[PDB]
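Q: A reviewer asked whether we had any structural model of the full assembly, not just the individual parts. We don't, so I'm hoping you can provide one. Inputs are below.
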Amino acid sequence: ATQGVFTLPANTRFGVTAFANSSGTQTVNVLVNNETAATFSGQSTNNAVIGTQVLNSGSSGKVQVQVSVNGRPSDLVSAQVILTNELNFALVGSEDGTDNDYNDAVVVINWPLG
Amino acid sequence: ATQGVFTLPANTRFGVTAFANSSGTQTVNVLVNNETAATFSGQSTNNAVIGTQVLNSGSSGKVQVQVSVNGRPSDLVSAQVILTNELNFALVGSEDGTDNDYNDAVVVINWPLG
Amino acid sequence: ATQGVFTLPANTRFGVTAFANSSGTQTVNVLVNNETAATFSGQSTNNAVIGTQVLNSGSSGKVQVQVSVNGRPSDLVSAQVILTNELNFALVGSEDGTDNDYNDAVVVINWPLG
Amino acid sequence: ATQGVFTLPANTRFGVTAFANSSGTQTVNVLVNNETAATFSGQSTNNAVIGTQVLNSGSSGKVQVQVSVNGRPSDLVSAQVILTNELNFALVGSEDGTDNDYNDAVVVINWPLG
Ligand SMILES: [Ca+2]
Ligand SMILES: [Ca+2]
Ligand SMILES: [Ca+2]
Ligand SMILES: [Ca+2]
Ligand SMILES: [Ca+2]
Ligand SMILES: [Ca+2]
Ligand SMILES: [Ca+2]
Ligand SMILES: [Ca+2]
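A: Here is a predicted structure for the entire assembly that you could use as a starting point for your response.
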């Protein structure tokens, strides 16, 4: 199934933050309406917060997270969870190798802000 | 129901990261086996990271997130989500007022690391 | 925080199913736009299905689950989870006593159908 | 990533329930410790409960859900969510065709019981 794709409410600010847990350098791209809106990278085996940014979901509300290592797409897992019918988290994990820890880059999207 | 309390596997490293979205200064305390292990404080209405840390769950695995504003506890909402039977997120939102956006401090715990 | 309240897409069929795990007879009410749309009542300590129904979310999309035992409201916990940006679960647990298992009535709402 | 595989606490009763939403007849197999423990089949486009059973997770705690339609494996999506650190849901959706609704067979596992 497709993973790392989320429909947000239109014209809404959201946070996106990425964490690294890998010997390989992670690159995280965040697309809004199919155009890159943020890119983060780093290399940590201790959960470094390699990047954070505030974005707007725009007219479409379509947000996509992609992760690559050495130019090769990682395998993604994702879900969205909503608490008290108000607080939203879109969650992504990724695997760059064979150990299947799926933490090599972790991406958290949250809304609303403010 | 109790919120913000999570049982992690014992003796496991985990990440904890807090974001703020409120005019009030947020104080996030993270307890491991009922003792304060980390504390983050800050103010933002733009989802700023007010702190991040890596902790060990210890012998009990018991982790609790508390959120307060000027010493008064916020109302918490939380859940744990597990992707591909491996990647864990413990998620907390909090409300310091009446608008019920539950984003005033947002706390993300993730494991495993490395 | 309020629990057991969910905003569904409008005019959408959804499933609602209730399970019981308690010495007490559970009464589950499902409200659509603040009006009772289904009521399930039964008793089991073995996860028996006490009711299942397909309902329409109507013009508002507002769906609320209430649980009581001998007329006393149970304490609720809830969340919504979305898989592959398409498959939705609205999940409710409830506690009628002191053991905090939160399984006394378990309610699963799923959509889309068909 | 692997989907439909869950690690439950050992020697624990759990509920497993399957719903159908497809023109094709669904076959759901539930494995405990790699051995078939339950099997459900049926056709519905109205969320019929094609099976519900209480099983024991045994010494391993390993539970796997497989879904097929006239012998062809469906593509699976899955996640686990835990509410109030007590109430567990393991969720599976499946796609047998081209529309990517992922509801063709829906399987919900819940624990603890009683
Ligand atoms: Ca890895
Ligand atoms: Ca890793
Ligand atoms: Ca607020
Ligand atoms: Ca706020
Ligand atoms: Ca109980
Ligand atoms: Ca019970
Ligand atoms: Ca389908
Ligand atoms: Ca379908």
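A: Points you may want to mention in the reply: Chain A has one domain: 1-114. The pocket of calcium ion (ligand 3) is lined by residues B 95-97, 99, 101, 104 (CB under 6 Å).
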